[PDB]
Design a protein that fits this description.
heterotrimer; A alpha/beta; B mainly alpha; C alpha/beta; A: alpha/beta; Helix Hairpins; 3 domains; two-stranded antiparallel sheet; 16 helices; B: mainly alpha; 10 helices; binds guanosine-5'-triphosphate; binds guanosine-5'-diphosphate; binds methyl N-(6-benzoyl-1H-benzimidazol-2-yl)carbamate; binds chloride ion; ubl conjugation (chain C)
Chain lengths: 426, 155, 426
């Protein structure tokens, strides 16, 4: 039933705040916690993300974490900033300086226990805890370094709970800091072993969408986060609203993850809109299979789909949906592995998102995601070959062979995808 | 030894401690264990004022470490645009190849330093230079779908 | 008067049990509160207040579905202690339903069943409703069947099993669960009536003019067929008067205990003035594949047994004449070691249809239960989907992580291979 949300670091807290603004509006929740909605459907599954306080007040089951005090002040200044439980703000004083080592072994380790005490308090309150949800970047130090430390500590305490992450992947197009490949490679190692699902939210792709499709000369983090919050809203639709699907996180992962290490998804969304600016079902179905709509800078046609889940939101003909979805598979039958029968599934929710009569969200488990990891591995290897900036990490206790291991594990993952990309039914 | 102290002073960016060490005869072209010189380290960590001072006093702009890395390789990898321009102005080999077959254009391409890419091209970067896997800088931009970089490499 | 206890496992079982007991009540003139202004005592106990209470248990590992029974029109009908729910479901994982989560509630389910059996003067056995694809309908059912064979060794056990169809399912692991539960249940079940959701789906579309059938559309049609299969147990007829007789008339060999059901006529409620179909017409429709519960071609197979269960205004002489015509048909080939004959039962009550359903009233209807080798085609389809996924070990880690050994996959698959061979050797 209940989900415990965590958001770590500057990026984690920023996209995490935007997620709560979006689904709160969908559920008709006031910035003070008061429900002021029209429909009863807005409340059926409200307990999944909201604790039901005394005065008919709904309080996000969210924990906010950061070694930087600044980002916490900015959350409260937001529209819904005072909706969060004050005691669920856990922040250090020093900051992470974009150093994965500082977040994972040094400052982060000093603060991780204080964070788990807050997680435990939220958990014991849950009737039947469904899983954990984390938002964070992989290129920084707090979200990447301390986020993955949090995941492994949460995995120890709650081994039988699902752990999904919305992980933002670094791109030179968004932040120029050149240690991000280090931080992301060290983190992806952690995610491969300790998360059940990971949504690859690639800043490369977010920028390209804004810059080339939405024609935004200079995309801001708000332009990028508009795409992220809309994606996260659709990805969690089946959990938050009544409809065909009644599945918990565990059931959603069981049918999407054929292999334990291949749980990194390509999320997509249609239509793509800029902040403040209706498609047919065929135009919706075509768009979300189109490379331009992917939130991970990968071309699906360069790989093969293992599993695909799509959720349509709005009032629309289910039959027309079934036919279009059928139209794509048979037309592109080669891009879907033939050794997982019926691997493309569809769901519909009559309640559309804010400002749209029609929308659809795409969740792909595609071998083409290896293009993302090969891009990071290439940058990682360019820096690591020249040993540039390693002192920042070895000075924080890290061993140098941790870098070789992360690189090695990164490439084993790439090889796994390529293995199943070439396998046949025979 | 004054060479080790000039190396460390150039890494940390201590401008004043560089000229003092150079005032007591510090080897401007001193090498560490891996063959890096003060100019390698100042260019790696964005210390422009030390880069220019070293070049005014006998620094080999095209010195190479054990792995064949020149100062321009490192400045291009890390993204220091001004340092890249100074080095070229003082005769940096725009097409120096290291032990991995990489040229400064390769490393600027890999790391998405588009401004450096353009500068290197304007100074004669070889678009046909192949690394030890056969990739040119344009191959790298196609393989990782970098449309912005590919357009730059085609003009 | 020998009692029968119905057990409904998982969402599919529960929701189909709802439609069945809904229909049972109407056929015996029982109100939703059990009040009534003899024969049906086999399925309904009788209290001192005159309340007729189903001899039924509903079991699910999460409470969403059974909670609607506890608040629907029939909240008064059932024993409340016979509506049993856990809090966390099997996540479409056979292993969860059988090994980890299922074992946390099995003892309670048995004690509640014992309570019902203690009120039986001569318990015949159990009717078990469940899906193949669900983790509860598969894993917990096979666990329940194993435990019932130990505690009720002499009693008979019948299954109504929902065979998976991609058109109305969002799970990809259903082939696994389907073979796993069949393997471990085969030896503990005396007779099993499989319901192919695709067959019910096509019937709802072709005969009932329903473009997008819901689970309610399917279940009302399914319950109409279950009712006609169990009618003999509730109306003191001549044919199949006790559970033991199902096996005698339909199962010449214990492993080949999957009879094919064919029901006719299915007419849309919009055609309230259709010309009534003769006995000969509805009988010939029992040999049209389009009316069968499992999709397969009996013309390829051979009959080992054949029962015709008529309901309504049916004169025995017209049945003998219609069968006389059927025996000339070349498509109907019996095995050489069986009486080439049809066991006939007639229930002169006019068929009942639920108010709110999609079926027109008819004066006469029939259900043919036949044990044909052709149903092995339905096993072949499942076995093939199983083979494609298990060749790459896809999804297997989900099961191994829930108290199951990988060897059980191949052990179950070999059992299926031996079952297909059993059909070939007949
Ligand atoms: N005919 C029919 N089929 C159903 C119904 N509900 C679910 N199914 C089918 O059953 C399969 C899914 O398994 P469920 O029965 O829903 O799962 P479960 O037994 O509750 O076990 P869990 O995995 O723990 O949820 C799919 O093939 C569905 O198409 C129903 O009401 N009627
Ligand atoms: N989309 C998005 N990405 C961000 C945001 N803030 C930082 N990032 C990315 O995250 C990386 C920097 O990590 P950051 O979260 O700032 O470090 P941390 O605070 O220590 O966890 C860079 O790749 C940034 O592009 C944001 O608001 N939105
Ligand atoms: C907080 O973390 C998550 O929300 N994780 C997550 N995983 C998912 C997988 C699938 C879906 C669907 O919408 C769906 C659509 C059609 C058929 C089946 C499922 C939704 C998911 N959400
Ligand atoms: Cl579907
Ligand atoms: Cl006969
Ligand atoms: Mg269920």
């Amino acid at each position: 039933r209940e989900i415990v949300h965590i958001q770590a670091g500057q990026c984690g807290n920023q996209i995490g705040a935007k997620f709560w603004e979006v689904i709160s509006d969908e559920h008709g929740i006031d910035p003070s916690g008061n429900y002021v909605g029209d429909s009863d459907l807005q409340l059926e599954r409200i307990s999944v993300y909201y604790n039901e306080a005394s005065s008919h007040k709904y309080v996000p089951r969210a924990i906010l974490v950061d070694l930087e005090p600044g980002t916490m002040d900015s959350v409260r200044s937001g529209a819904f900033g005072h909706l969060f439980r004050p005691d669920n703000f856990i922040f250090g004083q020093s900051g992470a300086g974009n150093n994965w080592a500082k977040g994972h072994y040094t400052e982060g380790a000093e603060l991780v226990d204080s964070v788990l005490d807050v997680v435990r308090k939220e958990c014991e309150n849950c009737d039947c805890l469904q899983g954990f949800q984390l938002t964070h970047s992989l290129g920084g130090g707090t979200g990447s370094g301390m986020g993955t430390l949090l995941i492994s500590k949460v995995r120890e305490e709650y081994p039988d709970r699902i752990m999904n992450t919305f992980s933002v992947v670094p791109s030179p197009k968004v932040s120029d800091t050149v240690v991000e490949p280090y931080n992301a490679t060290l983190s992806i190692h952690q995610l491969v072993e300790n998360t059940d699902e990971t949504y690859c939210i690639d800043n490369e792709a977010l920028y390209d969408i804004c810059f080339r499709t939405l024609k935004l000369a200079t995309p801001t983090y708000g332009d990028l986060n508009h795409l992220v919050s809309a994606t996260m809203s659709g990805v969690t639709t089946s959990l938050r609203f009544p409809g065909q699907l009644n599945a918990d996180l565990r059931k959603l992962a069981v049918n999407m993850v054929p292999f334990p290490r291949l749980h990194f998804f390509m999320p997509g969304f249609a239509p793509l809109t800029a902040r403040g600016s209706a498609l047919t079902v065929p135009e919706l179905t075509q768009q979300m299979f189109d490379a331009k709509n992917m939130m991970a800078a990968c071309d699906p046609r360069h790989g093969r789909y293992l599993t695909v889940a799509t959720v349509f939101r709005g009032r629309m003909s289910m039959k027309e949906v079934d036919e279009q979805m059928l139209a794509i598979q048979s037309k592109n039958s080669s891009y879907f592995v033939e050794w997982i029968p019926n691997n493309v599934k569809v769901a519909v929710c009559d309640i559309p998102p804010r400002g749209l009569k029609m929308s659809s969200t795409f969740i792909g488990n595609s071998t083409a995601i290896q293009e993302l990891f090969k891009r990071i591995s290439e940058q990682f290897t360019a820096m690591f070959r020249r040993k540039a900036f390693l002192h920042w990490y070895t000075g924080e206790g890290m061993d140098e062979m941790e870098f070789t291991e992360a690189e090695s594990n990164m490439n084993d993952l790439v090889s796994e995808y390529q293995q199943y990309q070439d396998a046949t039914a025979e | 030894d004054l060479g080790k102290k000039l190396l460390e002073a150039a890494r940390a960016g201590q401008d004043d401690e560089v000229r003092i060490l150079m005032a007591n005869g510090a080897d401007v072209n001193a090498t560490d264990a891996s063959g890096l010189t003060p100019l390698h380290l100042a260019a790696t960590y964005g210390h422009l004022e030390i880069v220019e001072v070293l070049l005014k006093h006998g620094a080999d702009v095209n010195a190479i470490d054990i792995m064949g890395s020149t100062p321009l390789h490192l400045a291009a990898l890390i993204g220091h645009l001004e340092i890249v321009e100074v080095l070229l102005k003082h005769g940096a080999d725009v097409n120096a190849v290291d032990t991995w077959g990489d040229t400064p254009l390769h490393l600027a391409a890999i790391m998405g330093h588009l401004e450096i890419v353009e500068v290197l091209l304007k100074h004669g970067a070889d678009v046909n230079a192949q690394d030890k896997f056969g990739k040119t800088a344009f191959d790298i931009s196609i393989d990782n779908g970098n449309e912005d970089l590919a357009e730059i490499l085609q003009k | 008067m020998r009692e029968c206890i119905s057990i409904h496992v998982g969402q599919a079982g529960v929701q189909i049990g709802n439609a069945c007991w809904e229909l049972y009540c109407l056929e015996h003139g029982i109100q939703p509160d059990g009040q009534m202004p003899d024969s049906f005592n086999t399925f309904f106990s009788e209290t001192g207040a005159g309340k007729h209470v189903p001899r039924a248990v509903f079991v699910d590992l999460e409470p969403t579905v059974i909670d609607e029974v506890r608040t629907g029109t029939y909240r008064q009908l059932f024993h409340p202690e016979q509506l049993i729910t856990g809090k966390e479901d099997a996540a479409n994982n056979y292993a969860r339903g059988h090994y980890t989560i299922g074992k946390e509630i099995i003892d309670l389910v048995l004690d509640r069943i014992r309570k019902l059996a203690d009120q039986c003067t001569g318990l015949q056995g159990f009717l078990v409703f469940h899906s193949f694809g669900g983790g509860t309908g598969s894993g917990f059912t096979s666990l329940l069947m194993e435990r019932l064979s130990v505690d009720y060794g002499k009693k008979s056990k019948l299954e109504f099993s929902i065979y998976p169809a991609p058109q109305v399912s969002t799970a990809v692991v259903e082939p696994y669960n389907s073979i796993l539960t069949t393997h471990t249940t085969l030896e503990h079940s005396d007779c099993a009536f499989m319901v192919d959701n695709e067959a019910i789906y096509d019937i709802c579309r072709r005969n009932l003019d329903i473009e997008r059938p819901t689970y309610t559309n399917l279940n009302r049609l399914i319950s109409q067929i279950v009712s006609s299969i169990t009618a003999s147990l509730r109306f003191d007829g001549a044919l199949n008067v006790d559970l033991t007789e199902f096996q005698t008339n339909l199962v010449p060999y214990p492993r080949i205990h999957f009879p094919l059901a064919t029901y006719a006529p299915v007419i849309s409620a919009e055609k309230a003035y259709h010309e009534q179909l003769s006995v000969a017409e509805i009988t010939n429709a029992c040999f049209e594949p389009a009316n069968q519960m499992v999709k397969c071609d009996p013309r390829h197979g051979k009959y080992m047994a054949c029962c015709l269960l008529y309901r309504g205004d049916v004169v025995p002489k017209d049945v003998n004449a219609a069968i006389a015509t059927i025996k000339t048909k070349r498509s109907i080939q019996f095995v050489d070691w069986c009486p080439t004959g049809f066991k006939v039962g007639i229930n002169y009550q006019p068929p009942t249809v639920v108010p709110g359903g999609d079926l027109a009233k008819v004066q006469r209807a029939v259900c043919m239960l036949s044990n044909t080798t052709a149903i092995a085609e339905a096993w072949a389809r499942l076995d093939h989907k199983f083979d494609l996924m298990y060749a790459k070990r896809a999804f297997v880690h989900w099961y191994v992580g829930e108290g199951m050994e990988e060897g059980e996959f191949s052990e179950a698959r070999e059992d299926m291979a031996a079952l297909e061979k059993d059909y070939e050797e007949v």
